[PDB]
Amino acid sequence: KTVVVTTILESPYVMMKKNHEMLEGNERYEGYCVDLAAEIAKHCGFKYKLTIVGDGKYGARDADTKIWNGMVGELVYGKADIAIAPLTITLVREEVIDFSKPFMSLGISIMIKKVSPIESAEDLSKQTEIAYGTLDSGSTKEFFRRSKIAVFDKMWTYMRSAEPSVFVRTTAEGVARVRKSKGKYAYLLESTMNEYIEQRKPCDTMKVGGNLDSKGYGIATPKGSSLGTPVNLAVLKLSEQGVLDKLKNKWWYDKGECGA
Amino acid sequence: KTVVVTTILESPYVMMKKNHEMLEGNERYEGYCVDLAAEIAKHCGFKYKLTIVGDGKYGARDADTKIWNGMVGELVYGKADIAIAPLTITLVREEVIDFSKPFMSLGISIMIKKPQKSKPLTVERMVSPIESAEDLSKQTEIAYGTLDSGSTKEFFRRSKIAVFDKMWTYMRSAEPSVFVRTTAEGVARVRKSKGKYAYLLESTMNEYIEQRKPCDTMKVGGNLDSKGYGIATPKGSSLGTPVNLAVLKLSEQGVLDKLKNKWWYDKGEC
Amino acid sequence: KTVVVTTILESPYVMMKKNHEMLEGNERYEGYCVDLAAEIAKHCGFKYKLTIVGDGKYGARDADTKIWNGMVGELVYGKADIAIAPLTITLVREEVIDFSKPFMSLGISIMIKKPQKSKPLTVERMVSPIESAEDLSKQTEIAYGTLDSGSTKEFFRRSKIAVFDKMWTYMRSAEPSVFVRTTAEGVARVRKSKGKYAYLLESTMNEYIEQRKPCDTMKVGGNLDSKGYGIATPKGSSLGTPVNLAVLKLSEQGVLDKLKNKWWYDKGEC
Amino acid sequence: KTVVVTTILESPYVMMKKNHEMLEGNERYEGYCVDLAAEIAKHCGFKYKLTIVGDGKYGARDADTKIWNGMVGELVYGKADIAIAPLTITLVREEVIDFSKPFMSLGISIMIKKVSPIESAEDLSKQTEIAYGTLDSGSTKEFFRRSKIAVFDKMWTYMRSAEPSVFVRTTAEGVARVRKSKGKYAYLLESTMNEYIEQRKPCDTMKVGGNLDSKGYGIATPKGSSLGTPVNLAVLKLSEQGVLDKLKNKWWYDKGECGA
Ligand SMILES: NS(=O)(=O)c1cc2c(cc1Cl)N[C@H]([C@H]1C[C@H]3C=C[C@@H]1C3)NS2(=O)=O
Ligand SMILES: NS(=O)(=O)c1cc2c(cc1Cl)N[C@H]([C@H]1C[C@H]3C=C[C@@H]1C3)NS2(=O)=O
Ligand SMILES: NS(=O)(=O)c1cc2c(cc1Cl)N[C@H]([C@H]1C[C@H]3C=C[C@@H]1C3)NS2(=O)=O
Ligand SMILES: NS(=O)(=O)c1cc2c(cc1Cl)N[C@H]([C@H]1C[C@H]3C=C[C@@H]1C3)NS2(=O)=O
Ligand SMILES: N[C@@H](CCC(=O)O)C(=O)O
Ligand SMILES: N[C@@H](CCC(=O)O)C(=O)O
Ligand SMILES: N[C@@H](CCC(=O)O)C(=O)O
Ligand SMILES: N[C@@H](CCC(=O)O)C(=O)O
């Protein structure tokens, strides 16, 4: 039996091949998550079919609908059997899907186009001169929405009452918006994507401050699926062998198309 | 029903109070781990009595007996219900106990005695003989060893990377013994080994020791790997999922970050 | 019985909220005095309806008429029960109303338009034409005035100190009138007089305006005197002692200074 | 009828002149408080006799006996009719005595030996190398005792568990102790006394940091006394006339026996 795999087009996690028009099958996709899925299949001993979500979203609860979108929806409603992607582990997700051990650490980061008067997010909240936004249907807006810290509460109140809309459809669109804003806009994304962007050419963006929280990406499985334990063991074993570190170095720092 | 919480006397996780002679019960201890246990008990209602492992060992397999010893061992045999302590999540441990999501990240680091200033117009620069694990393996004048019955020793034993393989080869056949019985033992060996000994230990304890007086030691190089501390639980226990959700919730509120800052950076000096 | 609280539309004490067009009740306002009144009502339980003075005046006794106008007047004549507002404690007001212990210190200061930095090896030095009150009275090119029907004007009118007597003599007989009807109007006059008008106002308001955008005004010299803001209460009322105890408790608990810091220094644009 | 006035021997509030053995009556005392009492008597129109409290105590509640000692006890128990002294206005005091308007502002300050390593209260509390103490039976210890702020709670816990006794009977003895500690002792006292000490020879002590809070000195009268309103009006009139400022300048900076 073939296990269907859902994943999002995220760099450097899943990329579209430069010759993907003439390429078919699992060889048409490449990236960190493609390699992760290949090793997971090899360790578990199953055949997998790579698929891309119809909606370019990670997953969130809708407004008064109780409906999951993105990969979480593809997993809960029986449309998929596993999800290998940068899916942040969150309480509102673990209650509906099975999360494996984190295969990559990360945090909330601030990315700003090139004295550094922004520094930490505290001064970012204290000053309203520059507008900042996040990604819709992810884990950053969800983190800001249910935060009990007063400072994060003020940031979220600014986020919701933003004119015009500050949330961006895709992280690439957010990168383009901050690039073309001439330093008037800031983007709140995760540490891994922030590093991958600020380190790739043309290196016109940068990461300021630190990490507002500590999170991780996990392999997601349907609630009650028998594949959760094998993929958890596979992730643990790959961590012991340090293959995750080698994949991170290959897809992040091996090329290094910048002067650093 | 009261559930016994196995733990280990490790700073700043679990430390005895200054007035611990007159005190009794759960008030005998302080640090990160006792606050973590209090938060876990607040999340899901249970009665817990703090206990310390008799042998003071984190957990590993014995020699030719296939017997689990230490925290993991006494969790498997039923002597404890939950292990709220800096237990490292590993492959072998997960096969016999249930781990939760990591509540704190860590890596394997190198601790050496802090050298003196260069003092050569008038600038004092710090020169260290060891800057990474590779040159530590290449060199021979400085000895290095890990803590026995711990995750670092088991990681070096099964490592297939060439640098780590040769490191483990040296450590296995090192005369005299380079392994230590406790973290404080290795720290003392580093402190009064005249810079001839290096300690391979977790990053968090390394920063804790480096941040406190007399602070005559420093951490060299980056982290050898990336692991985390998880709350342990026997297979099939009803506590697993509630504790996992409690750890997730505490991570979401930033309680873990606040506890780490309060017990690591706030009380720092030098 | 619901008591009526009288305030004044003064920043950052009582400020109109952005979404105040669709808001009814005590949620229309924000600032320092609103939460001060909230804490007062939490200490001594009562229901309060925040009201704004009709004429927007702090309080003064009109000569040859013997009628108090403004917040003090409407507190005296029975149409008010408590005045939680930046009302300055004075000798004349105390004889007619009950004041509590001061909840925030203050002093009379001078506000001038911030001058341009001096070009001359490459240091930008800041030169101001007025540095105290003695030279402000000695000079004549820069006019100065106070707020009408305020504490500062009454202080200058009855002042027997030579410099203050000269200042009051100049202000009383001056064409055009140097007195202002509102603090914001005086600040606008200072900003649009091209440095030819100095405003005599309280130190708290002056510092708040200096700390906020566009940051084109500066405070010169020290405070001319030392006074305080007190919660007003009609003479022979039952709310005086509980309000005084509440003010003392808030001062000792750190509510007052935390509120002042979070409404003055936290939102510092410049 | 002669109004009995109680006061404490505090500088520059009350002094025993320089040849008080040859002087009798109110002519043998000098200071800020003596002048203040003189103006109070002039405004109210009464004859007063200056007396020094037998116990050098500002006033506090004893060990589970509910007894006031010092000037507050001298007023509550009918021993005196008024107290002109640096009596800090405190919430617990106001419940038993009538306080006038504050005639002198102040705050809690830190006085150390002559970039300080402690400066702020946070660093001083964190650093346990140097012991810090307050005045026994005053108001600083009372303020620290009932502080619910975490930092001040930690400082108070350090205060109570101090070996040997860090509290000092008299502020002059505290000054002597810090002068005889080689910078190993810090004294927590009021801003006015700290400034007066640091602005007098030989000027080996300095004030560091800001003020922990804002207090004031009041003129205390027995509960339900007819003198409270006249002395309150006198204080207001003196403040409006600027006499209090001139007295502070006379007794704090006019002499200026320091190099600065
Ligand atoms: N350096 S990294 O971000 O690519 C990275 C991050 C992590 C890795 C492995 C790597 Cl290579 N493994 C850990 C896992 C291993 C075991 C201990 C913690 C989890 C379970 N999670 S992690 O701390 O999120
Ligand atoms: N900054 S830290 O080391 O105290 C720290 C480290 C970590 C935290 C939370 C904190 Cl505060 N939570 C994460 C967990 C939360 C969810 C996402 C990854 C795991 C599941 N693990 S972690 O990456 O090991
Ligand atoms: N720092 S401040 O201006 O916000 C400020 C100023 C003052 C405060 C409290 C604060 Cl937070 N309390 C005092 C009062 C408290 C008790 C002691 C003096 C009076 C009665 N008045 S004050 O000296 O006018
Ligand atoms: N500059 S000072 O410390 O000598 C000083 C301090 C103060 C003075 C007067 C002087 Cl001179 N008067 C005020 C009083 C006057 C009226 C307003 C507040 C009280 C009632 N209290 S105060 O703000 O504590
Ligand atoms: N990987 C994140 C993306 C959200 C973000 O871009 O912040 C998630 O699954 O929610
Ligand atoms: N924290 C480790 C022990 C310390 C070490 O091995 O260095 C564990 O839980 O296994
Ligand atoms: N705060 C003053 C008014 C302001 C002023 O006079 O400058 C009062 O209550 O009277
Ligand atoms: N002057 C204070 C006591 C002195 C101090 O606390 O340092 C009082 O009246 O209580």
User: Do C204 and C85 form a contact (C-beta atoms < 8 A)?
Assistant: no
Q: How far is C144 from D205, CA to CA, in rounded Å?
A: 42
Q: How far is CA A185 from CA A181, A194, B174, in A?
A: 6, 15, 58
Same domain, D42 and D57: yes
A18 class by beta-carbon count within 10 Å (0-12 exposed, 13-18 middle, 19+ buried): exposed
Chains D and A touch (3+ CB pairs under 8 A): no
Q: For residue A140, which of A152, A150, A127, A129 has the smallest C-alpha distance?
A: A152
Please name the residues in contact with A128: beta carbons below 8 A apart, sequence gap of 6 or more: A158
Question: Other CB atoms closer than 10 Å to residue B240's CB: what's the count?
Answer: 19
User: Do A134 and A167 form a contact (C-beta atoms < 8 A)?
Assistant: yes
The dihedrals phi and psi of B33, each to the nearest 5 degrees, come to -70, -35
Q: How far is C82 from C45, CA to CA, in rounded Å?
A: 14
Q: Is residue D260 part of a domain?
A: no
What is the Å distance from ligand 4's center to D104 Cα?
Answer: 5
Closest ligand to C-alpha of residue C202 is 7
Query: Which of C41-57 are b and which e, b meaning 16 or more Cβ less than 10 Å from the residue's Cβ?
Result: beeeebebebebbeeeb
D7 class by beta-carbon count within 10 Å (0-12 exposed, 13-18 middle, 19+ buried): buried
Tokens at residue A52, please?
């891309």
Tokens at residue D24, please?
């009798």
Q: How far is D18 from D28, CA to CA, in rounded Å?
A: 9
Q: How far is A141 from A136, CA to CA, in rounded Å?
A: 7
User: Do D222 and D75 form a contact (C-beta atoms < 8 A)?
Assistant: yes
Q: How far is C72 from C87, CA to CA, in rounded Å?
A: 9
Q: Is residue A258 part of a domain?
A: no
Q: Is residue B167 part of a domain?
A: yes
Determine the residue of chain A that is closest to B89 in CA distance: A236
Does residue B122 have a known ligand-binding role? Answer: no
D190 lines ligand 8 (CB under 6 A): yes
User: Do B49 and B26 form a contact (C-beta atoms < 8 A)?
Assistant: yes
Residue that is written with structure tokens 């099939």 in the block: B236
Paired sense of beta strands B2-7 and D205-208, if any: unpaired
| Contact list, C266 vs chain A (CB under 8 Å) | 126
Residues framing ligand 6 (Cβ under 6 A): B 58, 86-88, 146-147, 150-152, 201-202
Report the C-alpha dihedral over residues D68, D74, D77, D80, rounded to 10 degrees.
-160
Helix (H) or strand (E) holding B262: helix B255-264
C148 class by beta-carbon count within 10 Å (0-12 exposed, 13-18 middle, 19+ buried): middle
Residues comprising chain D, all counted: 260
Cis amide linkage into residue A202, ω under 30° from 0:
yes
Q: Which amino acid would we find at residue C138?
A: K
Same domain, D51 and D117: no
Residue that is written with structure tokens 């992607």 in the block: A85
Q: How far is C106 from C87, CA to CA, in rounded Å?
A: 11
Q: How far is CA B189 from CA A80, B244, C89, in A?
A: 54, 37, 69
Chains B and C touch (3+ CB pairs under 8 A): no
| Longest alpha-carbon distance in chain A | 58
Nearest-5° Cα angle at B92, B89 to B95: 95
> What's the structural domain count of chain D?
2
Q: How far is C234 from C240, CA to CA, in rounded Å?
A: 8
User: Do A246 and A252 form a contact (C-beta atoms < 8 A)?
Assistant: no
Same domain, D240 and D196: no
Beta bridge partners, A216, equal A105
| Longest alpha-carbon distance in chain C | 70
Show the domain range for A56: 2-105+216-253
Q: Is B33 helix (H, G, I), strand (E, B) or coil?
A: helix
Q: How far is C19 from A225, CA to CA, in rounded Å?
A: 50
Please name the residues in contact with A253: beta carbons below 8 A apart, sequence gap of 6 or more: A199
The dihedrals phi and psi of B24, each to the nearest 5 degrees, come to -150, 160
Q: How far is CA B129 from CA B112, B196, B202, C56, D29, in A?
A: 9, 10, 21, 75, 72
What is the Å distance from ligand 1's center to A103 Cα?
Answer: 5
Q: How far is C257 from C237, CA to CA, in rounded Å?
A: 28
Final residue in a domain of this structure, among C220, C237, C255: C220
Paired sense of beta strands B232-234 and B97-99, if any: antiparallel
Concatenated DSSP letters for B150-173? SHHHHHHHH--SHHHHHHHHHHHT
Question: Other CB atoms closer than 10 Å to residue A212's CB: what's the count?
Answer: 26
Of all protein residues, the one whose alpha carbon is nearest to atom 5 of ligand 3 is C104
**Neighbouring chains to A with at least 3 Cβ pairs closer than 8 Å:** B, C
Final residue in a domain of this structure, among C220, C238, C255: C220
Cis amide linkage into residue B176, ω under 30° from 0:
yes
Residues comprising chain C, all counted: 270
Q: How far is D13 from D8, CA to CA, in rounded Å?
A: 8
Please name the residues in contact with D24: beta carbons below 8 A apart, sequence gap of 6 or more: none
Tokens at residue B53, please?
């492992």
Measured over the CA atoms of residue B176, residue B179, residue B181 and residue B186, the dihedral's sign is positive
CA D212 to chain CA centroid, nearest Å = 16
Q: Which amino acid would we find at residue C101?
A: K
Q: How far is B159 from B180, CA to CA, in rounded Å?
A: 20
Q: Is B29 helix (H, G, I), strand (E, B) or coil?
A: strand
Q: How far is B42 from C110, CA to CA, in rounded Å?
A: 56
Question: Other CB atoms closer than 10 Å to residue A173's CB: what's the count?
Answer: 12
Please name the residues in contact with A232: beta carbons below 8 A apart, sequence gap of 6 or more: A100, A101, A219, B94
Q: Which amino acid would we find at residue D52?
A: I
Q: How far is CA D189 from CA B203, C216, C270, D158, in A?
A: 43, 39, 34, 17
Please name the residues in contact with A252: beta carbons below 8 A apart, sequence gap of 6 or more: A12, A192, A195, A196, A199
Q: Name which of B23, B261, B269, B270 to mutate to probe chain D: the one with the most chain D Cβ atoms within 10 A of its Cβ.
A: B269
Q: How far is C139 from C161, CA to CA, in rounded Å?
A: 17
Q: How far is CA B87 from CA B60, B258, B260, C163, D95, in A?
A: 11, 20, 16, 75, 56
Tokens at residue D66, please?
């509910």
| Longest alpha-carbon distance in chain B | 70
| Longest alpha-carbon distance in chain D | 56
Q: Count each helix (H run) and each strand (E run) in chain C, helices first.
A: 10, 14
Q: How far is B219 from B114, CA to CA, in rounded Å?
A: 9
Beta bridge partners, C6, equal C51
Please name the residues in contact with A21: beta carbons below 8 A apart, sequence gap of 6 or more: none
For residue B122, the distance in angstroms to the closest alpha carbon of chain D comes to 22
Q: Is residue B74 part of a domain?
A: yes
Task: Write a three-state SS string for chain D.
Answer: CEEEEEECCCCCCCECCCCHHHCCHHHHCECHHHHHHHHHHHHHCCEEEEEECCCCCCCCECCCCCCECCHHHHHHCCCCCEEEEEEECCHHHHCCEEECCCCEEECEEEEEECCCCCCCHHHHHHCCCCEEECECCCCHHHHHHCCCCHHHHHHHHHHHCCCCCCCECCHHHHHHHHHCCCCCEEEEEEHHHHHHHHCCCCCCEEEECCCCCCEEEEEEEECCCCCHHHHHHHHHHHHHHCHHHHHHHHHHHHCCCCCC
Q: For residue A94, which of B229, B245, B89 has the smallest C-alpha distance?
A: B245
Nearest-5° Cα angle at C42, C36 to C43: 95
Q: How far is B36 from B14, CA to CA, in rounded Å?
A: 11
Same domain, D153 and D240: no
Same domain, A116 and A54: no
Please name the residues in contact with B262: beta carbons below 8 A apart, sequence gap of 6 or more: none
User: Do A149 and A118 form a contact (C-beta atoms < 8 A)?
Assistant: no
Q: For residue A189, which of A96, A103, A86, A52 has the smallest C-alpha distance?
A: A86
Q: How far is CA B233 from CA A147, A240, B5, C180, D63, in A?
A: 29, 21, 10, 74, 51
Q: How far is CA A224 from CA A53, A98, B231, in A?
A: 22, 8, 22
Q: How far is B147 from B137, CA to CA, in rounded Å?
A: 17
Please name the residues in contact with D245: beta carbons below 8 A apart, sequence gap of 6 or more: C225, C226
Question: Other CB atoms closer than 10 Å to residue B74's CB: what's the count?
Answer: 21
Same domain, A45 and A137: no
Q: How far is B128 from B126, CA to CA, in rounded Å?
A: 7
User: Do D229 and D221 form a contact (C-beta atoms < 8 A)?
Assistant: no
Closest ligand to C-alpha of residue B185 is 6
Same domain, B200 and B240: no
Q: For residue B166, which of B186, B148, B140 has the smallest C-alpha distance?
A: B140
Q: How far is C266 from D6, CA to CA, in rounded Å?
A: 44
**Domain CATH number, residue B198:** 3.40.190.10
Q: Name which of D140, D142, D211, D239 to mutate to probe chain C: the one with the most chain C Cβ atoms within 10 A of its Cβ.
A: D239
Measured over the CA atoms of residue C75, residue C78, residue C84 and residue C89, the dihedral's sign is positive
Q: Is residue C269 part of a domain?
A: no
Residues comprising chain B, all counted: 270
Same domain, B8 and B89: yes
Q: Is residue C50 part of a domain?
A: yes
Q: Is residue D247 part of a domain?
A: yes
Q: For residue C187, which of C171, C204, C206, C174 has the smallest C-alpha distance?
A: C206
CA A41 to chain CA centroid, nearest Å = 22
User: Do B111 and B198 form a contact (C-beta atoms < 8 A)?
Assistant: yes
D53 lines ligand 8 (CB under 6 A): no
Q: For residue D78, which of D95, D93, D62, D97 has the smallest C-alpha distance?
A: D97
User: Do B264 and B211 form a contact (C-beta atoms < 8 A)?
Assistant: yes
Q: Across the C/D interface, how many CB contacts are shorter than 8 Å?
A: 60
| Contact list, A126 vs chain C (CB under 8 Å) | 266-268
| Contact list, D126 vs chain B (CB under 8 Å) | 266-267, 269
The answer to whether the CB atoms of B90 and A216 lie below 8 A apart is no
Same domain, D39 and D124: no
| Contact list, B151 vs chain A (CB under 8 Å) | none
Q: Is residue A78 part of a domain?
A: yes
The dihedrals phi and psi of A210, each to the nearest 5 degrees, come to -140, -135
C105 lines ligand 3 (CB under 6 A): yes
Same domain, B36 and B75: yes
Cis amide linkage into residue D12, ω under 30° from 0:
yes
Indicate which technique resolved this structure: cryo-EM
Same domain, A70 and A90: yes
Tokens at residue B139, please?
């060199």
Q: Which amino acid would we find at residue D251?
A: W
Q: For residue D143, which of D205, D193, D211, D230 has the smallest C-alpha distance?
A: D211
The minimum-distance atom of ligand 2 relative to the CA of B260 is 4
Measured over the CA atoms of residue C31, residue C37, residue C41 and residue C43, the dihedral's sign is positive
Q: How far is CA B164 from CA B138, B229, C195, in A?
A: 11, 22, 73
Tokens at residue B47, please?
């009665």
What is the Å distance from ligand 1's center to B156 Cα?
Answer: 17
CA atoms within 13 A on the CB side of D207: 19
Paired sense of beta strands C14-16 and C29-31, if any: antiparallel
Same domain, C194 and C239: no
Chain breaks in chain A (C to N over 2.5 A) after: 114
The dihedrals phi and psi of C153, each to the nearest 5 degrees, come to -65, -45
